[PDB]
């Protein structure tokens, strides 16, 4: 019922999102993009591991769902159901068409959704305890088999999912350049009202 | 009714071995890679099943 | 053989049961007890313990003295129904004390750790007691 992924592997069709022009699009296979302990604050999960994809191709929505399940089964089995947070950093926005059965009026109707990646772009993200690095690489290594192209595993120097480096994360939090809320942190520039400096720092 | 000391002697040559999962090749008990090029010396090995 | 020696153990206690006990399988070795011996077997081993109560039985021709080896979890579960600090100390007094022990702080630690399944003195699990073992650590000798 679905064509092989080799028929839509390449980004050659001028991004075609679901809009008022492209209606009647079936729902994408992947609806959940965050798994594990999505509530762990910032500190228990300082280790962030990424799956970057070094090919300009498009990954389908069913492949994104399949790799997410594959990474969830392993991370739960090994690190524990509460020992990790997963974030699929790819959304299947592009819509692929199919010309069902000659060439007259060949413009196809939507059939599925894919996500287009670049040479440097993370597909999946896992934050967890520091001692789970080997388990994170293995979980990503297995989920990589569910994608058409070639991907790399990279242990990011940044603290968890936060955009700030792990070595300096603790000391700016200490001097309150960052405050923790939710899964990430809030940068606090020293250029706002002074009353907001004094409700902090006190 | 084979006496056990000779029974272990025969199993050493018939039973106690590893089998390649890709080409079924009979390999020594300590084999880690298959010795045959037809499978590409794969390390996917399994012990030979016992009759127990 | 001590005029009889049919030493074998059994893993029942508390409720009499008799039929529910595994005694019929263990009966033939002595050839003495049968059903009547089983009934008297649970009579002394009725209470303390009220639990699994593994006992080592020394034979008495027809009767069978049911001396119970003081198993750790057995005595711990028997006492627990909770501080029992002195009660865990006496529970750590009557049993054989081999433990591959050296001093009294050792046995207080080892018996203290065995009762992790059923906690320990009021609001503290029996491990943070194990580190700072000073109170009564030498109260047995």
């Amino acid at each position: 019922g679905r064509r092989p992924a080799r028929c839509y592997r390449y980004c050659k069709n001028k991004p075609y999102p679901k809009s008022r022009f492209c209606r009647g699009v079936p729902d994408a296979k992947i609806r959940i993009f965050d798994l594990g302990r999505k509530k762990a604050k910032v500190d228990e999960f300082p280790l962030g591991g990424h799956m970057v994809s070094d090919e300009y191709e498009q990954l389908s929505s069913e492949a994104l769902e399949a790799a997410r399940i594959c990474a969830n089964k392993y991370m739960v089995k090994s690190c524990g159901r509460d020992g990790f947070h997963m974030r699929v950093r790819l959304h299947p926005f592009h819509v692929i068409r199919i010309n069902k059965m000659g060439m007259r009026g060949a413009f196809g109707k939507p059939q599925g959704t894919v996500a287009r990646v670049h040479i440097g772009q993370v597909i999946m993200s896992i934050r967890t305890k520091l001692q789970n690095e080997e388990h994170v690489i293995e979980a990503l290594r297995r989920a990589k088999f569910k994608f058409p192209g070639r991907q790399k595993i990279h242990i990011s120097k940044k603290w968890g999912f936060t955009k700030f480096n792990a070595d300096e994360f603790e000391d700016m939090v200490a001097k309150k350049c960052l405050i923790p809320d939710g899964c990430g942190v809030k940068y606090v520039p020293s250029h706002g009202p002074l009353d907001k400096w004094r409700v902090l720092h006190s | 009714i084979i006496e056990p000391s000779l029974r272990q002697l025969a199993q050493k040559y018939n039973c106690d071995k590893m089998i390649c999962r890709k080409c079924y090749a009979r390999l020594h008990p300590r084999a880690v890679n298959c010795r045959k090029k037809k499978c590409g010396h794969t390390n996917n090995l399994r012990p030979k099943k016992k009759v127990k | 053989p001590n005029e009889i020696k049919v030493v074998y153990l059994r893993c029942t206690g508390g409720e009499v049961g008799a039929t529910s006990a595994l005694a019929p399988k263990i009966g033939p070795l002595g050839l003495s007890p049968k059903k009547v011996g089983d009934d008297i077997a649970k009579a002394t081993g009725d209470w303390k313990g009220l639990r699994i109560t593994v006992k080592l039985t020394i034979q008495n021709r027809q009767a069978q003295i049911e001396v119970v080896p003081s198993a750790s979890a057995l005595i711990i579960k028997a006492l627990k129904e909770i501080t029992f600090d002195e009660i865990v100390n006496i529970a750590r007094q009557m049993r054989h004390r081999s433990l591959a022990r050296e001093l009294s702080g050792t046995i207080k630690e080892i018996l203290g750790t065995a009762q992790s399944v059923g906690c320990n003195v009021d609001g503290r699990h029996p491990h943070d007691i194990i580190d700072d073992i000073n109170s009564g650590a030498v109260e047995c000798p």
């Binding site: - | 084979i2 006496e3 000779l6 002697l9 025969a10 018939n14 030979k48 099943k49 009759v51 | -």
Partner: protein, 190 residues
């Protein structure tokens, strides 16, 4: 990577005498002579002393493929040495479940006759390699004593008997019967 030099040395006992003719080692131990050429490899062989009689091989710019042949040669020469001072004796037992395996040793221990293997009517005749003599031992109920000076020939003849008694079309985890090598020792036990 090419090593400057890979070499290793073997010691020669007093009783046995080794002479070199190119890459051809000849040993003159008490139990006969053993000769084996090595011209399929490129090493240099030398006798070092006149009193302790040391045999040395060198490799001189080999990669790891041909570095492995330095100790292969020395192992062979040691096998030559042991084969002429102590000889090779491959005891091997015959195990059978139901049908006894009857072995008849024909002329001067060079032909063996496997009769009742799995109760077949086919007689298996296997010819020992030259210089290898097989026999039926008196110590054990049923086992072959095939002795010799060359380990390659003795072990190959032992393999000829072992592969001759192979159960076909049956489960070989059962039907464990046949003749297999039990121990590999020497003669004179020294």
């Amino acid at each position: 990577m090419k090593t400057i030099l890979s070499n290793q040395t073997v010691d020669i006992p007093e009783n046995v005498d080794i002479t070199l003719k190119g890459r051809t080692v000849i040993v003159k131990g008490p139990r006969g002579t053993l000769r084996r050429d090595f011209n399929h490899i490129n090493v240099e062989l030398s006798l070092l002393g006149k009193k302790k009689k040391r045999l040395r091989v060198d490799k001189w710019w080999g990669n790891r493929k041909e570095l492995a042949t330095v100790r292969t040669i020395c192992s062979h020469v040691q096998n030559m040495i042991k084969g002429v001072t102590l000889g090779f004796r491959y005891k091997m037992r015959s195990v059978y479940a139901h049908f006894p395996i009857n072995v008849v040793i024909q002329e001067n221990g060079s032909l063996v006759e496997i009769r009742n293997f799995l109760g077949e009517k086919y007689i298996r005749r296997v010819r020992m390699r030259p210089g290898v003599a097989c026999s039926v031992s008196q110590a054990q109920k049923d086992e072959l004593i095939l002795e010799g000076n060359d380990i390659e020939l003795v072990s190959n003849s032992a393999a000829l008997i072992q592969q001759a008694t192979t159960v076909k079309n049956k489960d070989i985890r059962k039907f464990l019967d046949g003749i297999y090598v039990s121990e590999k020792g020497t003669v004179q036990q020294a």
